[PDB]
Design a binder for this molecule. Structure first.
Ligand code: CYC
Ligand code: CYC
Ligand code: CYC
Ligand code: CYC
Ligand code: CYC
Ligand code: CYC
Ligand code: CYC
Ligand code: CYC
Ligand code: CYC
Lengths: 97, 162, 60, 172, 172, 162, 172, 162
């Protein structure tokens, strides 16, 4: 029997079905609701504050970078997201910290 | 997801600072690792079907009681779900290899895994055995650096199952 | 006046942490909390409720 | 959060006089049936994993788009979230059943729940369906006459039905 | 927040599919141009003070009404917030340039920026002008052949231009 | 100090988790980049005298008024202070190169730099010109990727001052 | 924290002198063996549950006092604490192996562990024995030449032994 | 331990006032039907050994594969450890009965149960089956509200294992 389709299209079909486990079955179809795992936090814009930014923890001994990053996170949370100027920065409180 | 580039960017951002030399060297390391990781992803994608069917048979061999009726692995639907699950695991391992991070595995598999396993009484030893077969086979499908990358991610999944 | 309270968490605290869980990272047993006079009573009441045992209390 | 007694007391206070003899008869009868009420709350509490496993299995049988790639229960994270929500809503229904009032359920559980699901992209109709299935399994367990003295408890079954139906209606 | 790799992974996951041969080829091409990407990111990072300085100089030369009493950059506090905003936008542009995806801008940098500027009464057209001037100043440092290997980095130029234009278009 | 290994350990530790693929990829990138970095450290160490002398001379060329009476560059003690400070900057730059990270420059120079310079009325632009001279001379001293490593560290110092 | 590079830098900073040629040579050698170090760290990490399981099984075979009622690890919570402590000490040993300096282990954890175990009533000898058994278990995985290029890594074995033994000395 | 008397006092201290009507007579609610609980504890204590042996046999019948060589069940030592574990559960059920509170269960079994079983690869379904057997046997050994009391505590443990 002569070929019914060109080999390029057979290759395309084979490699489309190769990227599925089981190829194309009724049981293994993608969900019509095409939601990624990060759909909700991405559409809400809360991905950064809810999952991505780590919880900043500071213990009794620490290096310089740990201290400075802790201070940045603290000022960006406690003072809202408002710009705190250098004249407003509390020095004695962080010396005690 | 939590990959090298994304960790770099997020750690720098939460500290309100640009990307420094260390962060760029991490990115450079990721870009160098891309070659063996993507070649391993190619190898595991190409051989996905024999891998998954052999893994299901390995599970049934180490856990013979499962196929008997009245328990989890009896029936075509249950075994089809088994193959689907191991296909999911392999898929997300390939995603991790491509992304050069445990991000896809953590977001899509590791998070909430234990609660789901308890809810449906799916024994983690099943999946550990399937991943062990995948490990043995990728020992024979890959070599050198790609082998090490694939093994890293497979062991990550196994360690997070146990 | 200022009061330094040296508290050493004990098994009564360990059982509470085993039930409730660590929403915060695990820390060492003994440490000192520096409080004013005004906060002193609520601080002591809270440490007692959590099961923590005070090693001692000093004034300054 | 108020129970049947506090509900009666608030209604009496609004008009501003004592609880009438009919009200006190109602409340004394409630307290007399409170033993059966405790049995019902125990039935819900001891069989929560069974009820929620049954409901989840039925729900992902009827609605397969939830558990397949792209679905809202696809990865383990969202699947665990789904089963967790089922646990929570069953918990608040049992609370309300013990209270004899649905104020704890409405006030603490279902008040911003539709808004939450709408913001997250969660099918509120699927959640309502899950609550209905979970009601059916719970009603199977409530009616169980083993280990417990036999007697009429139709009022309790109807009341638990209203609590689940109110949860479903509030979500959807 | 995604890079190019996690974006491809999310697409393949929505399909329920392993990544295709061609997808892996495009990803390996992205990762092979990675060193040029790193040099571009380092050019943005290292010259940021110069970029914000000359952008601000041009902007306050063009729009003198911003620095007049009653303008929006008049007191030192408003001028300092202006320079902080320019600094931040440049930082997130460099983040996006390293990631290869503009997801960091809309996830983080522009998440509520327009609403912020409308609440504050900041002229968003001036912020668009500032971002454009920062693009102009950045392109000089990106194209600088000095002390890096000579090659074609025009795709990186286009990508940085698109990121700057995205920030400007979201603000205005 | 903030190094690649330091960031690896800190990030994996704060989350209470063992090291994994992304973290070891970053460490691998650091160990790979080490060779140009130590090359550059050796090159800068051999030429510290000429580099510091030229940097001081470049500062005096760019700001002639500094040397006039009544200003900061008048007096041999102040000239020695200048050369001492530039030697400190160069030494910490080589430390950054060796550690493969801006940790040494951050801890020993950048932290407190602004308030110290404000207190003693030290102009940052002086140090920026000195570091620009050193940056120019690294090109005539270094070639390859070592030049790039040295330049990122020197530009980090310059940005910290600017 | 502190690494071997940072240690050398700190020492050279105390004398106020550049890094001497010999120090540069030692650090370059360390960076050369850093690949083998990464392999050793991955060997410890990838088998951490197996190391903990083997060590705990061997220990509770040795010492049945802890398991039996009234022992320091009798109930499920104290067993869980035991296993978590072994987990943490393995994690810190692996961190120190990657760094090459035990600072990561010495400052955060070991300084307070003596006082904690003394207050809680744990037998420090048993904890030290657990760490030693853990070292013996992890040595087997560090020896394994399967899946890794065969070479000489006795320096890594000696350094890991140093970490484990001096951790135990901190507990013991 | 989370006893109802304990919860009486804990609520009092948390709200920081004396023991009011609700709270004293909630304690009275305990003091009323403690007698069925004490009788259930006594009945469980006498028949403890037959209960433990029967529960071990039920575990072996529902999970016959476990007894086979190469896994947890094999070995007289593991048989004995199974018996000891079922004895522990029964003892803590009796403790919760006599205390009229689940606190003995939640602190001697439930707290840390999942991590322990996971680390020692103990299937919770074994203990669930043993507890179900003990539930069946307390159904016939115990009558009246006493039985009800016992059953709840048993079921509580079951709900902890799932
Ligand atoms: C996600 C990263 C991020 C961004 C982007 C950000 C922008 C930002 N800019 C702000 C204020 C501001 N932003 C500006 C800048 C504008 N006005 C001038 O006309 C210029 C043309 C123009 C800048 C080029 C000014 C002047 C203010 C102060 C407004 C005021 O105080 O009245 C504020 C309010 C903070 C406060 O005042 O406490 C935010 C949140 N914040 C962030 O955390
Ligand atoms: C994204 C990653 C992901 C994974 C991995 C995943 C696994 C997974 N498999 C499931 C079903 C299942 N999976 C299995 C697997 C078993 N079949 C037996 O032949 C084997 C011994 C064994 C596998 C090795 C079985 C039996 C079920 C049916 C359990 C039931 O009755 O609900 C379920 C319950 C939902 C459903 O009914 O489909 C999940 C969540 N889900 C996910 O979203
Ligand atoms: C630990 C908390 C607690 C429980 C569990 C409890 C159960 C309880 N159920 C009782 C009777 C009863 N229990 C029920 C309830 C049943 N009727 C139908 O079978 C339904 C399936 C089911 C309830 C929906 C009924 C109808 C009675 C008889 C009426 C009565 O004596 O109050 C009694 C009275 C003694 C007896 O007649 O046996 C008790 C104490 N009491 C408590 O303080
Ligand atoms: C309400 C409080 C307030 C103050 C104080 C203020 C000062 C101020 N002067 C500026 C410009 C300037 N100011 C000067 C002042 C210099 N000219 C020389 O004759 C002197 C040696 C020296 C002054 C003693 C110079 C040279 C510039 C231009 C700097 C530049 O464009 O880079 C700028 C930058 C923006 C602009 O171009 O206008 C500010 C913010 N602005 C304010 O809103
Ligand atoms: C520490 C952080 C770090 C950086 C910064 C880094 C940059 C870097 N740039 C490189 C070359 C390069 N750099 C550039 C970029 C420049 N070419 C010019 O035309 C443009 C103005 C400009 C951007 C388009 C180009 C085009 C190459 C050669 C392409 C290639 O290496 O394959 C190389 C390879 C050198 C070689 O193999 O010959 C590296 C490693 N690597 C790192 O680990
Ligand atoms: C920085 C790292 C770090 C360490 C090392 C650490 C040790 C530590 N172990 C603890 C408890 C414990 N640790 C153990 C373990 C011992 N029991 C014996 O059987 C074993 C041989 C041995 C384990 C090897 C036990 C049994 C407890 C519980 C003590 C009790 O409840 O009485 C506690 C009390 C806190 C709690 O249990 O929630 C701490 C702080 N904490 C930390 O944050
Ligand atoms: C992402 C994390 C990562 C890993 C895991 C990694 C492993 C790694 N192992 C290697 C070979 C090697 N691996 C080892 C270590 C083994 N040899 C002995 O059998 C020991 C038992 C054992 C150490 C525990 C050795 C000694 C070499 C030879 C490299 C050399 O010293 O020349 C190499 C260099 C070979 C090459 O790529 O050309 C790498 C990069 N690289 C990475 O970037
Ligand atoms: C909700 C809190 C609460 C209250 C208010 C309370 C009162 C109370 N006390 C009782 C018996 C009693 N109460 C007492 C105590 C008194 N004897 C002496 O005169 C002393 C003044 C005092 C000792 C401190 C005694 C001796 C009995 C009888 C003992 C028995 O029941 O056998 C009874 C049982 C009588 C019945 O109901 O038929 C009640 C209800 N019981 C409670 O649980
Ligand atoms: C006081 C609360 C408490 C409980 C409940 C407890 C259970 C328990 N049983 C254990 C051993 C064991 N337990 C079993 C139980 C199995 N044997 C088979 O016949 C059955 C299918 C099954 C029982 C139903 C086995 C096989 C072991 C030895 C294997 C191992 O170490 O994991 C272990 C590991 C350490 C040891 O005891 O030697 C624990 C923690 N331990 C406690 O401190």
């Amino acid at each position: 029997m002569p070929a019914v389709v060109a080999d390029q299209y057979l290759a395309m079909a084979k490699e489309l079905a190769a990227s599925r486990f089981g190829g194309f079955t009724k049981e293994n179809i993608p969900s019509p609701m095409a939601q990624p795992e990060s759909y909700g936090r991405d559409r809400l814009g809360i991905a950064a504050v809810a999952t991505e930014n780590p919880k900043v923890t500071l213990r009794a001994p620490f290096t310089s970078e740990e201290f400075q990053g802790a201070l940045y996170a603290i000022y960006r949370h406690i003072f809202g997201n408002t710009y705190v100027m250098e004249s407003e920065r509390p020095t004695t409180a962080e010396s005690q910290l | 997801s939590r990959t090298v580039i994304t960790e770099v960017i997020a750690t720098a951002d939460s500290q309100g600072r640009f990307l420094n030399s260390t962060e760029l060297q991490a990115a450079f390391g990721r870009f160098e690792r891309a070659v063996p990781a993507i070649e391993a992803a190619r190898a595991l994608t190409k051989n996905q079907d024999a891998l998954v069917k052999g893994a299901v048979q390995a599970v049934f061999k180490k856990f013979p009681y499962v196929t008997q009726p009245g328990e989890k692995g009896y029936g075509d639907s249950n075994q089809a779900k088994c193959a689907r699950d191991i296909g999911y695991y392999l898929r997300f391992i390939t995603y991790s290899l491509v992304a050069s991070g445990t991000g896809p595995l953590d977001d899509y598999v590791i998070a909430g895994l234990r609660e789901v396993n308890r809810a449906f009484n799916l024994n983690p030893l099943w999946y550990i055995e399937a991943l062990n077969y995948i490990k043995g086979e990728t020992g024979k499908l890959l070599s050198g650096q790609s082998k090490t990358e694939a093994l890293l991610y497979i062991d990550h999944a196994i360690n997070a199952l146990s | 006046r200022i009061y330094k309270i040296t508290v050493s968490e004990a098994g009564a605290y360990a059982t509470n942490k085993h039930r409730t869980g660590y929403r915060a990272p695990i820390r060492q047993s003994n440490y000192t909390l520096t409080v004013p006079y005004d906060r002193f009573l609520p601080e002591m009441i809270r440490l007692h409720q959590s099961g923590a045992k005070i090693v001692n209390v000093t004034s300054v | 959060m108020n129970d049947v007694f506090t509900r009666a007391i608030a209604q009496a206070d609004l008009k501003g006089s004592f609880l009438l003899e009919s009200d006190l008869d109602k409340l004394a009868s409630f307290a007399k049936e409170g033993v059966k009420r405790l049995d019902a709350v125990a039935a819900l509490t001891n069989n929560a994993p069974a009820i929620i496993s049954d409901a989840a299995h039925k729900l992902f049988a009827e609605q397969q788009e939830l558990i397949q790639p792209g679905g809202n229960a696809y990865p383990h994270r969202r699947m665990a979230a789904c089963l967790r929500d089922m646990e929570i809503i069953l918990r608040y229904v049992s609370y309300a059943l013990l209270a004899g009032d649905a104020s704890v359920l409405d006030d603490r559980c279902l008040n911003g729940l539709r808004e939450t699901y709408n913001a997250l992209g969660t099918p509120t109709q699927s959640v309502a369906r899950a609550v209905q299935l979970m009601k059916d399994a719970a009603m199977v367990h409530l009616k169980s006459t083993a280990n417990v003295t036999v007697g009429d408890c139709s009022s309790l079954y109807s009341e638990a039905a209203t609590y689940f139906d109110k949860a479903a209606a509030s979500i959807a």
